[PDB]
Amino acid sequence: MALLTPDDLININMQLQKADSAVQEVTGLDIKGICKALYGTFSSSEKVGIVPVTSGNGIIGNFSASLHAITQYFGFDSFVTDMPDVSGYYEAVQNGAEIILMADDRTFLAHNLKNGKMANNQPCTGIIYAEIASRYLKADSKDVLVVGLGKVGFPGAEHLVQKDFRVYGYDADETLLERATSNLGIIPFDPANPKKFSIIFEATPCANTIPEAVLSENCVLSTPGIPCAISEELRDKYEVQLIAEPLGIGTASMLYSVL
Ligand SMILES: NC(=O)c1ccc[n+]([C@@H]2O[C@H](COP(=O)([O-])OP(=O)(O)OC[C@H]3O[C@@H](n4cnc5c(N)ncnc54)[C@H](O)[C@@H]3O)[C@@H](O)[C@H]2O)c1
Ligand SMILES: NCCCC[C@H](N)C(=O)NCCCC[C@H](N)C(=O)O
Ligand SMILES: [Mg+2]
Ligand code: NA
Numbered sequence: 001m002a003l004l005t006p007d008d009l010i011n012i013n014m015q016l017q018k019a020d021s022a023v024q025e026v027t028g029l030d031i032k033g034i035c036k037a038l039y040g041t042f043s044s045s046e047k048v049g050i051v052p053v054t055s056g057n058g059i060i061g062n063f064s065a066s067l068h069a070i071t072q073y074f075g076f077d078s079f080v081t082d083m084p085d086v087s088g089y090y091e092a093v094q095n096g097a098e099i100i101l102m103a104d105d106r107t108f109l110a111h112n113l114k115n116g117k118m119a120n121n122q123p124c125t126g127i128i129y130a131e132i133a134s135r136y137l138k139a140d141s142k143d144v145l146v147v148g149l150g151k152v153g154f155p156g157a158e159h160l161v162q163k164d165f166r167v168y169g170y171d172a173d174e175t176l177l178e179r180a181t182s183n184l185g186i187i188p189f190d191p192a193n194p195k196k197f198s199i200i201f202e203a204t205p206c207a208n209t210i211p212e213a214v215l216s217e218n219c220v221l222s223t224p225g226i227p228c229a230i231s232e233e234l235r236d237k238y239e240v241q242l243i244a245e246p247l248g249i250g251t252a253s254m255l256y257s258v259l
Pocket of ligand 4: 203
């Protein structure tokens with residue numbers, strides 16, 4: 001239901017440069033490094049076919065151009081097919097793609113035809129954004145607050161629990177908070193009894209989901225969420241270190257995961 005617009009993807013190369021610097025500042029690693037920690041993998045110029053898809057709301061302005069940019073940035077031999085849909089898929093396989101990258105309104109996937117691995121953008125994004133959050137060099141705690149427990153949030157929290165962090169979760173939807181607590185063992189967080197975190201992961205499609213009362217100074221807020229989870233004011237007031245970028249960090253996570 002929450003979908004990228006062309007405006008979100010303006011100057012994707014700067015957005016990506018900027019997010020990569022923030023990731024380096026927070027964790028000591030660039031995005032490649034994070035991906036190598038998660039998956040053990042690295043790029044070797046694998047050939048990536050990017051197929052536009054016209055189903056649902058259709059082709060999104062700047063979407064495949066941005067994927068072309070992203071993939072090039074990380075050292076893949078990528079290209080965008082002239083035809084969309086099934087015809088484009090055929091064009092890609094025939095033009096030697098080893099990994100297919102394509103999306104409809106519900107699923108963005110990467111499929112590596114050589115080894116059979118396939119990634120879904122939603123867990124891949126939650127996993128990398130959570131990993132990045134957790135690796136905050138100067139956090140001084142293994143307490144992590146996770147706001148948003150849907151298709152992106154839940155796998156991030158799960159990753160974090162598997163990584164032996166002490167995870168506190170909140171979702172405005174009590175059903176999703178309940179499922180996360182009874183399937184993962186996270187501690188349910190209460191906005192009425194807040195404590196401060198130096199590590200925060202947000203995966204929501206809503207503004208101002210991070211209360212002032214949970215922010216410590218210099219804390220990290222890692223969020224795939226659109227629009228921004230915290231106001232500029234609160235972000236300046238606590239010099240929060242923001243990692244937020246619309247497509248490329250999740251895309252890298254999908255790609256490095258199928259290698
Ligand atoms: N930057 C990227 O690369 C990237 C990749 C994937 C998704 N996204 C974005 O991530 C966001 C989340 O995606 P999703 O698929 O998990 O959505 P989802 O609907 O599956 O989950 C969103 C969750 O946030 C909860 N929520 C809404 N307002 C809240 C509030 N104030 N407090 C706590 N919880 C609240 C909802 O109850 C819901 O459970 C969307 O904005 C989507 O566009 C970004
Ligand atoms: N950046 C958020 C995560 C990636 C998926 C994103 N939610 C999204 O907008 N998905 C829809 C993508 C549709 C792509 C369209 N069929 C196209 O090929 O241009
Ligand atoms: Mg991203
Ligand atoms: Na948000």
